[PDB]
């Protein structure tokens, strides 16, 4: 642990204080796992399971939000809506884009998330 690490205290008690090392060296040292160089190492264990879910799972929501807002705006379109973003249809695809997680599983089973092999252009 970082609290009992013997090398992590030589960056504790000799560093600028400021507001980037004083309110950040604490919460960090309480709940991190340092090695031998006095450096927090991002671990992947059972204790990290409810730690790495908030970077991994909460990024998946906002990334799918962006990808589904870019989808629902662009199915309802036609070469002027990409230049001049129609703010009304953008808000319509954002409101539906909020709960995109449900809509995404309401497309795969219905077969309207994927296109047929003969309805998509290919090359020789």
């Amino acid at each position: 642990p970082c609290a009992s690490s013997p090398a992590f205290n030589e960056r504790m008690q000799n560093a600028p204080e400021g507001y980037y090392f004083d309110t950040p060296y604490q919460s960090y040292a309480a709940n991190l796992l340092c090695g031998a160089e006095g450096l927090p190492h991002q671990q992947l264990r059972f204790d990290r399971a409810i730690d790495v879910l908030i970077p991994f799972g909460i990024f998946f929501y906002v990334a799918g939000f962006i990808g589904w807002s870019g989808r629902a705006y662009l199915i309802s379109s036609p070469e002027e809506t990409e230049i001049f973003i129609d703010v009304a249809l953008a808000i319509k695809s954002f409101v539906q884009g909020l709960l995109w997680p449900l809509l995404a599983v309401k497309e795969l089973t219905t077969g309207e998330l994927t296109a047929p092999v003969s309805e998509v252009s290919v090359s020789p």
Binding site: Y20, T23, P24, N31, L32, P40, I54, D86
Partner: protein, 41 residues
């Protein structure tokens, strides 16, 4: 000002406002703990 609103809905204007609006997390990364590691939130 009929097309002044339309010019403000153009791709560069939406681009610049989107970057500055998502990138204003300056205040989110200064309000509480300007250093936030993976296991600390």
């Amino acid at each position: 000002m009929k097309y002044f609103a339309k010019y403000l809905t153009s791709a560069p204007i939406m681009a610049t406002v989107a970057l500055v609006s998502l990138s204003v997390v300056l205040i989110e990364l200064n309000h509480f703990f300007p250093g936030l590691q993976y296991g600390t939130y």
